[PDB]
Design a protein around this ligand. Sequence first.
Ligand SMILES: CCCCCCCCCCCC(=O)OC[C@H](COP(=O)(O)OCC[N+](C)(C)C)OC(=O)CCCCCCCCCCC
Ligand SMILES: CCCCCCCCCCCC(=O)OC[C@H](COP(=O)(O)OCC[N+](C)(C)C)OC(=O)CCCCCCCCCCC
Ligand SMILES: CCCCCCCCCCCC(=O)OC[C@H](COP(=O)(O)OCC[N+](C)(C)C)OC(=O)CCCCCCCCCCC
Ligand SMILES: CCCCCCCCCC(=O)OC[C@H](COP(=O)(O)OCC[N+](C)(C)C)OC(=O)CCCCCCCCC
Ligand SMILES: CCCCCCCCCC(=O)OC[C@H](COP(=O)(O)OCC[N+](C)(C)C)OC(=O)CCCCCCCCC
Ligand SMILES: CCCCCC(=O)OC[C@H](COP(=O)(O)OCC[N+](C)(C)C)OC(=O)CCCCC
Ligand SMILES: CCCCCC(=O)OC[C@H](COP(=O)(O)OCC[N+](C)(C)C)OC(=O)CCCCC
Ligand SMILES: CCCCCCCCCC
Ligand SMILES: CCCCCCCCCC
Ligand SMILES: CCCCCCCCCC
Ligand SMILES: OCCCC(F)(F)F
Ligand SMILES: [Cu+2]
Ligand SMILES: [Cu+2]
Ligand SMILES: [Cu+2]
Ligand SMILES: [Cu+2]
Ligand SMILES: [Cu+2]
Lengths: 382, 382, 236
Amino acid sequence: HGEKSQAAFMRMRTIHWYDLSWSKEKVKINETVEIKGKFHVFEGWPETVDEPDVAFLNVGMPGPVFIRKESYIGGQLVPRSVRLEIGKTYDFRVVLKARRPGDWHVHTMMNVQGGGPIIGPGKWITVEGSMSEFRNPVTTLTGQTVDLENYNEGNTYFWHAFWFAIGVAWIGYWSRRPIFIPRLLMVDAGRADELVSATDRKVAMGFLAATILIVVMAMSSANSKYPITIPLQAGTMRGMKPLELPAPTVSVKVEDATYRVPGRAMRMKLTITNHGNSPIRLGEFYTASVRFLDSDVYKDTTGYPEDLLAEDGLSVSDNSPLAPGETRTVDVTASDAAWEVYRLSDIIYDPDSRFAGLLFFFDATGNRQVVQIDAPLIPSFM
Amino acid sequence: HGEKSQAAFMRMRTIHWYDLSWSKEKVKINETVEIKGKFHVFEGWPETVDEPDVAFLNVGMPGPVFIRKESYIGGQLVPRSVRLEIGKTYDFRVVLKARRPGDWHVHTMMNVQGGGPIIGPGKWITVEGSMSEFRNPVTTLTGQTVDLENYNEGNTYFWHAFWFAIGVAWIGYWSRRPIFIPRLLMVDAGRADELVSATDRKVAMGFLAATILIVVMAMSSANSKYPITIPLQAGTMRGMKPLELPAPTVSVKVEDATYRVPGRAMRMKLTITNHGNSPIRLGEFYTASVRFLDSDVYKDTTGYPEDLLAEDGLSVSDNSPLAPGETRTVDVTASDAAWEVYRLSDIIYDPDSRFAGLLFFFDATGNRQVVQIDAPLIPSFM
Amino acid sequence: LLDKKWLTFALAIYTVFYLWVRWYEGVYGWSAGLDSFAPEFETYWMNFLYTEIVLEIVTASILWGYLWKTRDRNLAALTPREELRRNFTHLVWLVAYAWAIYWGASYFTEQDGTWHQTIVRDTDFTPSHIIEFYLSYPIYIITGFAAFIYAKTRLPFFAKGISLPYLVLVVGPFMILPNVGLNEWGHTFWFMEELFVAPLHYGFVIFGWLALAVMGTLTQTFYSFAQGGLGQSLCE
Ligand SMILES: CCCCCCCCCCCC(=O)OC[C@H](COP(=O)(O)OCC[N+](C)(C)C)OC(=O)CCCCCCCCCCC
Ligand SMILES: CCCCCCCCCCCC(=O)OC[C@H](COP(=O)(O)OCC[N+](C)(C)C)OC(=O)CCCCCCCCCCC
Ligand SMILES: CCCCCCCCCCCC(=O)OC[C@H](COP(=O)(O)OCC[N+](C)(C)C)OC(=O)CCCCCCCCCCC
Ligand SMILES: CCCCCCCCCC(=O)OC[C@H](COP(=O)(O)OCC[N+](C)(C)C)OC(=O)CCCCCCCCC
Ligand SMILES: CCCCCCCCCC(=O)OC[C@H](COP(=O)(O)OCC[N+](C)(C)C)OC(=O)CCCCCCCCC
Ligand SMILES: CCCCCC(=O)OC[C@H](COP(=O)(O)OCC[N+](C)(C)C)OC(=O)CCCCC
Ligand SMILES: CCCCCC(=O)OC[C@H](COP(=O)(O)OCC[N+](C)(C)C)OC(=O)CCCCC
Ligand SMILES: CCCCCCCCCC
Ligand SMILES: CCCCCCCCCC
Ligand SMILES: CCCCCCCCCC
Ligand SMILES: OCCCC(F)(F)F
Ligand SMILES: [Cu+2]
Ligand SMILES: [Cu+2]
Ligand SMILES: [Cu+2]
Ligand SMILES: [Cu+2]
Ligand SMILES: [Cu+2]
């Protein structure tokens, strides 16, 4: 819900999310929904964004309407920040547990230490039930099971109320007598030395000694109880395992790319060379969370968000099968209302008019090839 | 013209320029001259120079005596800063259009974000004609052709003169009356309240309102005209394609390297091992823009600058053909007046007495091998 | 008599000398002045540096010594008319100082920009480094010191004490010249980017601010003008 405002070229060339899947579209309270997919770190990472040396796999959502039970990059849990390598493709998996009823737009996002949020596609997930039914149990290494919704809440309230009461008692003790104007007049007109006299000093000594003694006793008691404590666990985690993708058998060279101002379409001319031994066909163009599909070649079945999915938004001038070894140049047009709804047309406002995306090529048997394209995007006005 | 002053070791180990060529040596006004070649980023990049993460392909020249029409790294245009990788070799091409008559020393240079200028070899290029004949036409996406020499000059002059006239009118309006001493005396001796009276306040209100209104109207008019504008296009460009050089079949180990103080010669002992299947011979030693050639092995035909070219400056103790598989150790002396003219002898003043360079090995058929050498450079005094 | 034609000479000498300097640097900027290790650079710019430094030292010594030696011992017995004439002469000195300050801190300083931001750079003594740091700076320093000394030695208002605004106006812009050390240390080492707005440029700027003391200096000169011959007319 935080994208459509970021720069179009920065959304195009940071991170490409694909193979996204959602386990469920509608859940009950305490029910789990799993989000899977892959993201590729673009080679032409913008210089204004710091390299993803420190990155965190986050969830785009309006507060804890879900709780993040687990999150994985590769196959290993990532509760801390992680290091990503430019040009690598990683697979991710986020497990969410429903907490608050309603209709929520859930995004998978990557926060980069020096570049800000990179928001992936968002999907509407319905939560039904009552928040009062939500439980977040956890078992500690000390052998006790607690609910994270209310654990330590009573202790926190008690201690804060106790110290607030001590301070209020001090202030009220000094506030029983007249406060401002008579005391000001006494201090000004001659030496005061009358508004602070025993047993006021004795009361202050008692307050100070009691404060120190209570702090020490409370610390000792909180050490006898909970004798086993550990510090906060933090630190960027290295050695994220990237996907070992096979080398693509399709090479694509972008010969100019244009978009009409104003308009809802993007046009580019591609020289596609088919290696390997199977006839390929262009089936998809993904630019920034928007999938332009050639419906005659490929159809989406993973429940991709409709406002981000162009079922027939990809038109190829000659999308006949490309025989192996054959090279041809075609005009590819990606047109959909999403191009203007998600403000991908506002790249005219950007200080770097370059686009990046993913082309998905499909053969007859159905196996697909992913190739990455990037080129300057030239607006056309007449 | 800015080298010969930089540190000798820093000129030796930053970037090695070779295969340099110039399309023309003498040009007319509006005529194009193209500079081509390769540069290799040295692996032992000095720590005092920031890594070439942000680098710009520039031209060393005394002001716009040429205009940079195009510049390429790899095969793609690079009007912005680019990212280079240490140890990689890139090919470059700069297209210059003559603008100012005269004899100009044109250098190809690489500016690094945190290290400063790395100046390559410079060549004298003669320009003949008149500056008045120079044209720099360009066609915009709005369908108009303008000359960059004088486009918008009239508008700039008009607006600056208009605002300067407004300010001068304000100052003169207040300067018609006596200015400094009577006004100072009036302000000092009693309340002034007489030198600023209506209609002075009315004139100031008119000035303020007219200024705001004129700014708003001028902005609106400059928006109605030129309705299509884009911000400045900036940003470091990643994904520079380096040359895929074959692995060299020659391995060279530097066993000590010395230079006489004072002197014009550098001496080093190399252990050369010939792999592959052809007899090789040492033909060139390039250290910092200076090419020491063994004239019996190789001759320069690319019109390299004479003051940087040592035709017989490279003497090898035994430069007989090196049979494949054979290893021999020879004494190599690089001697030329350039070693002192370009202050390569001043490495004795440097805080890091290490040299780097390129050795070019040629076989009978003429195909060449490039090997890189780097070692401490030990001065000798007696 | 009062204000005489010394003001015309004060303007004209700086104008003519600096126009000739600009012609010289236009002729020898390129072509004996690009390569700091060429022999012609030594004959056209290093010799210029040496000659200008020697001449500046000699001129400063002679001018300041003459102004101090010819100081008015009997300032008490100075008539108001003579005081008015001396005030006008001091104003001419201040005009010369303002003209020299312009030529030094605006013209040749932004010529350092046009030069360092277009040339491949090479030494601490580029032709722009010979003209701006070591000619125009010294010249305006000499003029400012001479104006201060003239005020102190001829004007009773500026006598019997060192005026703080005048001292700041005279010494702060002078501090730009030793600040050149920060410049050299500020490009060779720290900052290889030819940025002119780099913090190594702060010492000059900070000390360029001290020229704002001309405001207090000028109200002091106004009071000195309006001592005996303040009028009448003014405030009457
Ligand atoms: C506050 C006190 C300031 C003191 C410093 C003053 C610096 C003066 C210039 C230094 C020159 C130098 O050092 O160079 C010496 C130059 C080098 O040129 P050249 O190779 O002989 O060529 C021939 C000479 N042309 C190229 C000038 C034609 O020749 C000279 O003899 C000429 C110097 C003339 C300076 C006086 C004229 C100034 C303009 C008129 C209004 C005053
Ligand atoms: C208002 C201030 C006036 C000062 C005038 C200058 C007096 C110089 C005395 C002799 C010093 C010397 O000869 O030695 C200085 C050494 C030279 O070193 P070198 O050339 O590298 O090698 C050694 C070569 N010897 C052995 C032949 C010397 O150190 C330096 O590099 C410092 C030189 C920069 C001086 C900057 C002065 C700027 C003045 C500007 C006036 C408007
Ligand atoms: C009593 C208070 C006086 C203190 C002032 C003393 C001068 C400080 C010297 C710094 C040396 C140091 O500390 O370290 C030196 C560091 C080491 O960096 P490097 O790894 O070589 O970076 C390599 C980058 N190059 C290649 C560009 C160097 O270079 C610096 O970053 C210099 C920082 C600038 C500090 C000077 C600011 C002066 C302020 C002037 C405004 C009027
Ligand atoms: C090549 C260098 C030539 C410099 C000539 C300096 C002239 C001598 C300075 C001087 O004392 O006064 C010259 C003029 C007129 O003032 P004078 O009345 O001569 O000064 C003394 C005042 N007194 C007569 C009552 C005792 O006062 C002025 O306004 C002269 C201004 C000259 C401009 C400053 C030039 C400095 C360049 C470095
Ligand atoms: C370099 C940086 C300057 C540092 C700033 C310190 C000076 C600021 C205060 C000042 O200018 O006062 C010194 C006198 C003014 O008169 P006084 O300070 O009252 O003392 C006069 C006696 N004295 C000449 C020996 C000083 O003024 C003079 O007498 C100067 C003229 C005499 C000097 C001439 C010789 C110099 C040749 C190079
Ligand atoms: C208030 C500052 C005036 C600065 C003017 C200036 O720098 O003039 C040099 C420039 C040089 O260009 P140009 O006139 O074509 O003569 C070229 C001669 N050189 C190359 C030596 C400067 O133009 C002039 O000489 C005009 C005269 C203006 C008198 C106030
Ligand atoms: C009043 C504002 C001063 C801010 C200083 C500043 O902008 O410094 C930038 C610089 C950052 O260096 P950077 O801009 O990256 O320089 C790039 C070029 N090199 C690496 C050659 C210096 O930081 C420092 O080195 C410390 C400055 C101390 C000021 C008292
Ligand atoms: C002046 C008060 C110092 C209190 C120190 C208490 C130490 C208790 C150790 C558990
Ligand atoms: C107080 C003056 C504010 C001026 C605002 C003008 C807005 C014009 C929009 C084009
Ligand atoms: C590289 C970060 C430099 C930060 C400089 C801060 C300057 C602040 C001046 C008070
Ligand atoms: O004082 C010279 C101006 C900026 C620089 F980059 F050249 F250093
Ligand atoms: Cu959303
Ligand atoms: Cu990608
Ligand atoms: Cu040169
Ligand atoms: Cu190299
Ligand atoms: Cu500087």
